[PDB]
Structure 1
Amino acid sequence: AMVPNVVVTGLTLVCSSAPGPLELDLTGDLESFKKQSFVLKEGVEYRIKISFRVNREIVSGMKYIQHTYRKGVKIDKTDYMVGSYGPRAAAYEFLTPVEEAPKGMLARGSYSIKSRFTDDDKTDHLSWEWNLTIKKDW
């Protein structure tokens, strides 16, 4: 009861080219993302931004983990060391390095991503699943 020490609040694809917002509110119903997708134009640059709050005490070794699937088949895994954080009023933001969306006809289509935010105590701060659809155009 009932403000947890760590609350993962959002995922955003930061993409200058995109004509609309690309945000998941992670304080919401996580199951809903499975039938939703972010659309990205092929080859566009973007970062993933994870927003999270620390409310009471230091947390060490925060880590963001992504696994990428295509048609239910695992194709990639990436781990990002986020670091050690103490409490503060404002949400922290972790940004992945710039990446490009896949490009070329064979690579277009939908991909699913399983995301986890954890720490060196292996706490399941949040796990969620979301989809990315790569298209010729926005």
Structure 2
Amino acid sequence: NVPNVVVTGLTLVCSSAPGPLELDLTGDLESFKKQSFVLKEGVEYRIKISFRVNREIVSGMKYIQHTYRAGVAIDATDYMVGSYGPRAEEYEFLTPVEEAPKGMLARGSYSIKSRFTDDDKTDHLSWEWNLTIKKDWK
């Protein structure tokens, strides 16, 4: 049977972004490693993680995210998702509002290691993507 939990996507929710910033997590995750979303410095945003539970209840689901700059971790955050049972409709998790960095010295590439797990520490899905902070959506 298809995994009990299927992570289906990640969306960088930003009201002022010119276009959609989302990753399809149901396909090939390798392509993301060479790609990067552009985010204007200082803008507020959230991260929407779409997923579905197919058969059994899952408890303590957490969306983990480590952010690196110049190859070194500058932040680690565990987002308590919750315990949710099976449902036909796809679930969506929104992290609290975040604020992007500002100032020259904050600009540049940022790499993210993302993981969706639960209590049993199950690796429901892990993936790496990139971000680039710019003065404007340039």
Normalised by the size of structure 1, how large is the TM-score? 0.97
1:100 Cα offset (Å):
1.0
- Deviations, residues 5-59 of structure 1 (Å, cap 9, x unaligned): 1000000000000010100000011111111001001111100010010001101
Unaligned runs of 5+ in 1: none
Q: Which runs of 4+ in 1 moved over 6 A?
A: none
Show the counterpart of 2:101.
102
Determine the structure 1 residue equivalent to 2:62.
63
In angstroms, what is the RMSD of aligned CA positions? 0.6
Cα deviation for residue 71 of structure 1 reads 1.2
Q: Deviations over 1:38-90 (max 9, x none)?
A: 10011111000100100011011101110010111111100011010111111
Residue number in structure 1 paired with 2:4: 5
SS in 1 for 2:39: strand
Identity %: 96
**Unmatched tracts of structure 2, length 5 or more:** none
Number of equivalences: 136
Q: Deviations over 1:76-110 (max 9, x none)?
A: 10001101011111111111110111110110001
Shift of 1:4: 1.4
Residue 137 of structure 1 deviates from its aligned partner by: 1.1
Distance 1:100 1:63 in 2: 21
SS at structure 1 position matched to 2:26: coil
Structure-2-length-normalised TM-score: 0.97
